[PDB]
Amino acid sequence: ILDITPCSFGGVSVITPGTNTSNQVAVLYQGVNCTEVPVA
């Protein structure tokens, strides 16, 4: 017997201080463990 765990998905939210001020940004991957990022 196999358990199927449908593949990890979640919201992509982007963070910006002042786009007017700078063109650098940071990201949130909502509801996903860090393991699933260097893996992904």
Binding site: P6, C7, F9, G11, Q30
Partner: protein, 49 residues
């Protein structure tokens, strides 16, 4: 004072990882985003509240 912030992806709830049913949903178009704006609008006001 508040209720649970739920976020739903309508493009995924209607069908998961089928590009096909997703390609069909683009013929309705706007309705998915209209609900995303709405559920963001409920979710954000839980912090405000």
């Amino acid at each position: 004072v508040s209720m649970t912030k739920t976020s739903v992806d309508c493009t995924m709830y209607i069908c998961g990882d089928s590009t096909e049913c997703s390609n069909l949903l683009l013929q309705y178009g706007s309705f998915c985003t209209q609900l995303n704006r709405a559920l963001t609008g409920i979710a954000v006001e839980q912090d405000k509240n």
